[PDB]
Amino acid sequence: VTKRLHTLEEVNNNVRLLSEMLLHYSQEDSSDGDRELMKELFDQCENKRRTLFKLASETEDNDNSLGDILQASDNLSRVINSYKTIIEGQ
């Protein structure tokens, strides 16, 4: 399979889902399963933010959706740093 684009809804779906497991996380209780699938959602957030930037790079002067693209990326960025300051430390 090749690369593709992700809708705004899907972006929020990925964000909310990660913002779901991060809360239901416990270094002690949480097993390897939860931890593993959490890295997938994170890597996927990482990948979506990238495709959004590709969209942004092909934006034209006075584009009517550049704002949304960047907002979505911000959200992906905010939840990606949560998987950082939590799963790691900073």
């Binding site: 809708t7 809804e9 899907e10 779906n13 990925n14 889902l17 779901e20 497991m21 991060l22 809360l23 239901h24 996380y25 399963g33 939860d34 593993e36 699938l37 997938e40 959602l41 996927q44």
Partner: protein
């Protein structure tokens, strides 16, 4: 009973299962109608993954409940 398995794209597939059905069985049902290999499937409910060993009854999944599917 009837449950709803939501994908990240917002798609929805209703599966006709029983409180007895194992997580491995729900993944196999999805493969039969969607064709997605159980290997690439990862189900989530309440911020937790679902292991094939456990059953829907174990995770307390009621009718019309909504699971989350995440491909690799």
């Amino acid at each position: 009973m009837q449950i709803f398995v939501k994908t990240l794209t917002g798609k929805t597939i209703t599966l006709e299962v029983e409180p007895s059905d194992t997580i491995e069985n729900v993944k196999a049902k999805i493969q039969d109608k969607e064709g997605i290999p159980p290997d690439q499937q990862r189900l989530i409910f309440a911020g937790k993954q679902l292991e094939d060993g456990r059953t829907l009854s174990d995770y307390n999944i009621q009718k019309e409940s909504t699971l989350h599917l995440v491909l690799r």
